[PDB]
């Protein structure tokens, strides 16, 4: 058993992240209740080759702050988030 194998299985909660724009694959991330929304969004942005400062995660009907824990939101295995970006004109 590789020393880092333990790290692979930390947190058996699976969450689905839908990118709001484009038809690209949703991500199915394995996370812990103690994870922050920011930690999730960081992994999502890494996977999608996005910069870190341009998107937000949404859950139910609200945008999430990166500092909130998944635990504090009542997130459960299987829940779904959407990754949005701002739509602002001038």
């Amino acid at each position: 058993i590789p020393t880092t194998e333990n790290l692979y299985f930390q947190g058996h909660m699976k969450i689905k992240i839908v990118p709001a724009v484009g038809g690209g694959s949703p991500l199915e991330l394995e996370v812990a209740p103690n994870a922050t929304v920011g930690a999730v969004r960081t992994k999502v942005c890494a996977m999608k080759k996005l910069p870190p400062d341009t998107t937000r995660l949404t859950y139910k009907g609200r945008a999430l702050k990166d500092t909130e824990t998944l635990e504090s939101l009542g997130v459960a295995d299987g829940d779904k988030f959407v990754l949005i970006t701002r739509t602002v004109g001038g």
């Binding site: 839908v18 709001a20 484009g22 038809g23 701002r86 739509t87 602002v88 001038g90």
Partner: protein
């Protein structure tokens, strides 16, 4: 030059954009473009909108509009998705402002073939047509107006 070679807009989708814009000459309006890519062709199948705040010089679509629309499209059996956004520029002519460019750069980061449709309801092109363009930021970072049909 650019990720999208040309844009095909379903006539009713265009009509929905124009009517939305024409119904609020006193402020900018915005919404979302729904469709799919087909190779380098971007197909716009529908245009949808929702809660927003705007003035004659600015508009922001509530972010939960995008969230709702994306989740619905993802859940459905249709292979359609958000492909871009639109906004109006009443009496201000058709271009991407610095604000718009920033929004569009962010759309393209998530979906390389994304486009921004800008309509000015108070004007008509020239045979007449609707006063609009579909823009994309090119690979070298310039705003380009794409061929539309």
């Amino acid at each position: 030059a650019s990720a999208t070679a040309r844009v095909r807009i379903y006539p009713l989708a265009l009509a929905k954009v124009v009517k939305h814009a024409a119904s609020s000459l006193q402020r900018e309006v915005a919404g979302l473009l729904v469709g799919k890519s087909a190779g380098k062709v971007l197909e716009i199948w529908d245009a949808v909108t929702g809660e927003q705040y705007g003035t004659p010089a600015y508009v922001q679509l509530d972010e939960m509009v995008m969230a709702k629309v994306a989740e619905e499209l993802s859940k459905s059996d249709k292979n359609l998705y958000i492909v871009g956004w639109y906004h109006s520029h009443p009496g201000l002519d058709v271009f991407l402002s610095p604000t718009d460019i920033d929004t569009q750069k962010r759309y393209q980061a998530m979906f390389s073939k994304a486009v921004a449709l800008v309509v000015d309801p108070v004007d008509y092109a020239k045979i007449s047509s609707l006063k609009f363009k579909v823009f994309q930021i090119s690979k070298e970072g310039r705003v380009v107006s794409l061929p539309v049909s």
